[PDB]
């Protein structure tokens, strides 16, 4: 997160860290045994670390659970990043409490202007790479589809939405992928792509989860 702030230990109970000997992507717990992340975050031997703040130190509340399977969206396309969404089944159910809680799937899509909270352990610097030990948070509004598609001509599909600031200085960045974009207590987005980080006229592009609410439900229901 570039331009964000320190969330505060366990203040974002649904944030999970995708670890494989290092933090590579983010995710959000939607229930005790299922996590939502980005399809481009997929790799073998994914360990899901819940209840984290400082990813480098063990300070209580962590739950290390291994991915029992990662269900990438059948129609994911690595070039366009369309359908950039992946479900990760946990080997064992996580213990839910005040420090580890699931986030709600939206019932409808959010509107341009809606203030959302984006969080993650991704790069905190646009020009260079500085990673934080603790979870960073950022408040950013969903942009209007016209401003989104104008910034990324022909690259924005109906399953993508822009969130952020056109002036730059505040944006999600590498390491934040798979992370949550929560608006009014509903998981509205998954950190996906963007042209750099916190660059002017280059907002962050996110996976429009409302389009996948039914896919998610059915997939989970059959696994």
């Amino acid at each position: 997160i570039v331009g964000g702030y320190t969330c505060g230990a366990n203040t974002v109970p649904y944030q999970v860290s995708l670890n494989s000997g290092y933090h590579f992507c983010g995710g959000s717990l939607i229930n005790s045994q299922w996590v939502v992340s980005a399809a481009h975050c997929y790799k073998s031997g994914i360990q899901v670390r819940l209840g984290e703040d400082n990813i480098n130190v063990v300070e209580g509340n962590e739950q290390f659970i291994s991915a029992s399977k990662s269900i990438v969206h059948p129609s994911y396309n690595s070039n366009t990043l369309n359908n950039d969404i992946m479900l990760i089944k946990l080997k064992s159910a996580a213990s839910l409490n005040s420090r580890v809680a699931s986030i709600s799937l939206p019932t409808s899509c959010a509107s341009a202007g809606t203030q959302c909270l984006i969080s993650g352990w991704g790069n905190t610097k646009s020009s260079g790479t500085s990673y934080p030990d603790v979870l960073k948070c950022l408040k950013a509004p969903i942009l209007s589809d016209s401003s989104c598609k104008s910034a990324y001509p022909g690259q924005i599909t109906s399953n993508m939405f822009c969130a952020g600031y056109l002036e730059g200085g505040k944006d999600s960045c590498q390491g934040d992928s798979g992370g949550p974009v929560v608006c009014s207590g509903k998981l509205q987005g998954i950190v996906s792509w963007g042209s750099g980080c916190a660059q002017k006229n280059k907002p962050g592009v996110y996976t429009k989860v409302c389009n996948y609410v039914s896919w998610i439900k059915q997939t989970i229901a059959s696994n």
Partner: peptide
């Protein structure tokens, strides 16, 4: 030479810059 024009990059560790130059 460099990463095209506006290298569309994923925000993963490490990133995937499939670029935007079509």
């Amino acid at each position: 030479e460099p990463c095209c024009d506006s290298c569309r990059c994923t925000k993963s560790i490490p990133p995937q810059c499939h670029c935007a130059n079509i």
